[PDB]
Write a protein that binds this DNA or RNA. Structure first.
Lengths: 211, 119, 115, 122, 53
RNA sequence: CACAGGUGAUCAGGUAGAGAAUACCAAGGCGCUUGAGAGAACUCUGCUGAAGGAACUAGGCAAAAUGGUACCGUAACUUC
RNA sequence: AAUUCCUUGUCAGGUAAGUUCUGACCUGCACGAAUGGCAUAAUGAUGGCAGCGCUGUCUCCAGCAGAGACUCAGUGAAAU
RNA sequence: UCGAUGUCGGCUCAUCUCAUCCUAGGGCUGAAGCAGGUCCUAAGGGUAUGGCUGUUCGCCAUUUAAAGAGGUACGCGAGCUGGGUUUAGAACGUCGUGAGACAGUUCGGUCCCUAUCUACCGUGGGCGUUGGAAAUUUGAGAGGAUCUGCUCCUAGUACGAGAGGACCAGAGUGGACGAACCUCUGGUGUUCGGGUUGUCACGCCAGUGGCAUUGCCCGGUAGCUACGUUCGGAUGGGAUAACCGCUGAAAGCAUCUAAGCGGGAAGCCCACCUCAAGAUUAGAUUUCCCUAAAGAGCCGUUGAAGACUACGACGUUGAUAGGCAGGGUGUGGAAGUGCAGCGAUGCAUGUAGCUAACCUGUACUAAUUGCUCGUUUGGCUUGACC
């Protein structure tokens, strides 16, 4: 149930010999150093804590510097934790190594990332609200919300009403994506799909939960 | 949205913005030290430096190309006369921005734009 | 060349060699066709009216007039569907994209030869 | 991309000249019909003393579109007109001649005599 | 459109509880010894041991 | 109100143009007494738009479209 | 029918489908001959209906430009 | 309620009920099969586009698995519209001597409000969480999502006189919906490249620039984007509804029920995705630091982050931004010169010149070890241990 953290490198295509174009995305997979192994006895639950990337020393706090030093690993750009089980905590020891070898070609994986942020967005784009008449006497409410409720009964707006607000820039998971190719010497992970976020953003890849 | 976009609007049309930075570049080439708004100072680096780069090698085509973008035969002659063979060995960064506070009339952030090497 | 280093590796390993051709030229593209189980090569002759050069993402659209109605097909250059391309007539045009030929039919849908 | 109230050329020997889409079949709110999709049409112009009279309501198959049909390699294949071939009450071609090319999305069992009679099958 | 009752002076002042004045960051210039805003030239023109006039 | 309104007559440059239209200029006169940023939703005013083309709607409202000169050619009907 | 309630009268045409439209019928609730009858070329920013062209009217909205909106500095209302 | 609670319909946006339209599970059937008919359970999702008419409705056309019945001020005009109704003009029919009138008709006819409170959608500041800090997190809970067609095979088998034609199993391919994304196909692309009309200017020619909607036109990078691409709606667990039981007495029999043991739905609770310790019950783990420390903030360079914020990166021990270098992309053949031509122009030098936002690098410029906040071992009671 454990995965790895990567960085979105952009999209491309993979051509099959039969003459099909596969829309793929490239995920750079640096070393995932294991910074802590949490178990049911010390933490109440089993998980693996990993780090990847690098940070300069001036940008690493003393508390983090000691957290990494106990593991014996270099400070990464972030710290991510994967919920595991007894079978997953087999060869995973403190300061260990997690490469792209975790995945094999043809395996369905779950990729999570932060979506591109659109900022404040109206109901038309945020919630697929129908636009109102561009002509036919329509006043200054072309992309307006329309009605937001009923009359005196209930005399309020219900909670969860679809309205303008912040769009994107949220955690989003795409399921059922195939691993097109794995290359570990160069830290490659080619995956079929779209992978929420922009180029350069951190993405987490885990084995698919649907199965 | 504005993702990965470049350029300024500065509450002007594009024709006005183009003419305003042409005037600023000519003024900076003449006096070599001007005081302007900090957002304008930062964007002036993107219209004034590429003219200095192209004047590092002097030719009729380059001389005529500068005049197309500057429309000042006094500053184009100065650009290829002294500004060219002063930044020949300098790989960019021909001018520096120094913040100089706020404007009295409207409290706009001000900055001096100075050419490097004795402006 | 326009992308991150590591996407360029996934793209350089997939590059088919092909003769060079500009827009305006007449080309024959041999297209791999599979009926039920047998593979043959169908030919698509026509005028290159547009091409986008994007490395592995390169493409070119070819316009021919098949039995009255005109047909355009935007071939993906580096695709094993494209068996081969050969240039028959080199064209002499003044513009990357020949989109104006979609309103030209006969004696006006013709372009000068590059010699 | 054929939708209701869209005119299509007739690409078979049925006597119809232009037909208009009045329904995109195969779904409650199905919006568009591409090549290979069955539509309900009204014939708007017909040839004199033909098999189909002006004003009939019948079935047709879209055989080529101006929007174009995509291929697995990513290529698009566009035409200069939107054409249809008139069908039976059980959605079978009534054509003995096909005019112009058709695409290879008509391969199957019900549109085989449309592909065999087509001058060109892309 | 408009209020149905006047706001109390207490409620009006709670809206004013985020109304602060910005205080500039200052520094002492190495050469002139003068106080100036951080990352700004001194009133007589000195910034980071450099003259402007 | 230092208000986008109204207020009679006179003078009448150039290049295009039938023109006192229109576009760019002359003489002359101005930049319309808050600015600086940013470049969200939404509003206004515009530009472009795949495929379809009135399916919109009370209604083609709005928009789009047409647009010049010369020549050819032009129907029902008519009080000719 | 600018008159007809019953009424979306009936029949014909137009549309895939027409309470509107056109033609006709006459059963004129409740036309009718200078509070003029029936037509009528031309004319109308007149009412209705139908087409071609054309289109962001719409399917279904997208992108972009400018003015606000947002932030800072200055001045500083309103109804309640 | 008349010191004013805006009428019908449409648009937009909904929320609930179940007397259920579809899908799901059942009993009976005048249930052979396929299709139905009734009634029970069931509200999780879904539940058309048009022609006519101001219409709601209704008729009709074509679909669909289905085109549900209702409540919500006959939901919704400080959200839009304004066709009808219902002002003032005018006319017809009719009534009136008349002024006028008509749940008769007809043509025409100003829809204001910058949001204080509640509510809701987002996004912050403060304080608290038994010293402080950097991170990682558990999950009390909350929300989202929940639809379905067709084809193949089983099998032309069961069933049926034939016509026809399955349940239960399995494989695929869609439609509507949603999310993410921009590799592809396209759209846009007003600091990219060209063509071109008029005029003005740069002394003039040449070459360029201003203005005319970006003057117009043809293309087009990045980004954004759909109509493009990819993915999703689970076939699992638990307890149940109707319904069907097993054994079984009250009631020697019978009986699903009283004791006891089962099956059983798209429904409930989990399972998937997102949020979540202000869960004041304020949780947990790993480190770091305490005569201003660990850190945080200000400031600066900024970002596919963003209204302001917040969040992310960087600040010389540096690639954070701009420039610069080299590529790529786009445009399509610069200028100058030469040649051919009377000339317009064509050709060569030369796939040239230019090239936004792209890629990779590079300290040239700008990111000043400056200031502020934040301390000094963290109360007491009890128990175990020491």
């Amino acid at each position: 149930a454990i995965g790895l953290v990567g960085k979105k490198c952009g999209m491309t295509r993979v051509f099959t010999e039969a003459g099909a174009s596969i829309p793929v995305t490239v995920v750079e997979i640096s070393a995932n150093r294991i910074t802590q192994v949490k178990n049911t006895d010390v933490d109440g639950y089993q998980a693996i804590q990993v780090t990847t990337g690098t940070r300069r020393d001036s940008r690493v706090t003393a508390a983090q510097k000691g957290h990494f030093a106990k593991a014996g690993v270099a400070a990464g750009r972030g710290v991510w934790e994967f919920r595991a089980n007894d079978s997953d905590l087999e060869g995973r020891e403190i300061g260990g190594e997690i490469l792209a070898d975790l995945f094999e070609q043809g395996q369905m994986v779950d990729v999570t990332g932060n979506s591109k942020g659109k900022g404040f967005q109206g109901g038309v784009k945020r919630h697929n609200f129908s636009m109102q008449d561009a002509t036919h006497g329509n006043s200054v409410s072309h992309r307006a919300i329309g009605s937001t409720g009923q009359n005196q009964s209930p005399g309020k707006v219900f909670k969860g009403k679809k309205m303008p607000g912040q769009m994107g820039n949220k955690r989003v998971t795409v399921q059922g994506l195939e691993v097109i190719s794995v290359d570990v010497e160069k830290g490659l992970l080619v995956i079929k799909g779209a992978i929420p976020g922009a180029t350069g953003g951190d993405v987490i890849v885990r084995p698919s939960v649907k199965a | 949205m504005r993702h990965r976009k470049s350029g300024v609007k500065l509450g002007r049309t594009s024709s006005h913005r183009k003419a305003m930075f042409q005037n600023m570049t000519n003024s900076l080439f003449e006096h070599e030290l001007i005081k302007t708004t900090l957002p304008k100072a930062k964007e002036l680096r993107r219209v004034a430096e590429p003219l200095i780069t192209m004047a590092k090698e002097d030719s009729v085509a380059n001389r005529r190309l500068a005049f197309s973008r500057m429309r000042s035969k006094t500053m184009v002659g100065k650009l290829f006369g002294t500004l060219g063979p002063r930044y020949q060995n300098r790989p960019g960064g021909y001018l520096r921005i120094v913040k100089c506070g706020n404007r009295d009339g409207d409290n706009a952030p001000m900055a001096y734009v100075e050419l490097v090497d004795r402006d | 060349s326009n992308k991150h280093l590591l996407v360029q590796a996934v793209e350089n390993a997939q590059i088919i060699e092909r003769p060079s051709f500009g827009p305006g030229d007449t080309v024959v593209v041999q297209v791999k066709v599979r009926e039920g189980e047998r593979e043959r090569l169908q030919a698509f002759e026509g005028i290159v009216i547009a091409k986008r050069n994007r490395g592995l993402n390169s493409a070119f659209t070819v316009r021919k007039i098949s039995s009255g109605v005109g047909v355009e097909r935007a071939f993906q250059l580096h695709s094993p569907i494209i068996e081969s391309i050969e240039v028959k007539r080199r064209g002499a045009v003044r513009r990357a994209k020949l989109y104006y030929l979609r309103e030209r039919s006969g004696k006006s849908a013709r372009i000068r030869e590059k010699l | 991309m054929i939708q209701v109230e869209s005119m299509l050329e007739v690409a078979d020997n049925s006597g119809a000249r232009r037909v208009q889409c009045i329904k995109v079949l195969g779904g409650s709110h199905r919006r568009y019909a591409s090549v290979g999709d069955i539509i309900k049409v009204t014939v708007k112009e017909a040839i004199p003393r033909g098999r189909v009279k002006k004003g009939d309501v019948m079935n047709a198959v879209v055989v080529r579109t101006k929007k174009g049909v995509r291929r697995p390699d990513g290529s698009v294949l566009r035409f200069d007109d939107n054409a249809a071939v008139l069908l039976n009450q059980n959605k079978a071609p009534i054509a003995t001649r096909i005019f112009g090319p058709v695409t290879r999305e008509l391969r199957g069992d019900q549109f085989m005599k449309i592909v065999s009679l087509a001058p060109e099958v892309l | 459109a408009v209020q149905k009752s006047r706001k109390s002076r207490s409620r009006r002042d709670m809206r004013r509880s985020h109304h602060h004045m910005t205080v500039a960051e200052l520094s002492v210039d190495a050469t002139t010894g003068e106080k100036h805003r951080r990352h700004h030239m001194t009133k007589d023109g000195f910034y980071r041991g450099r003259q402007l006039f």
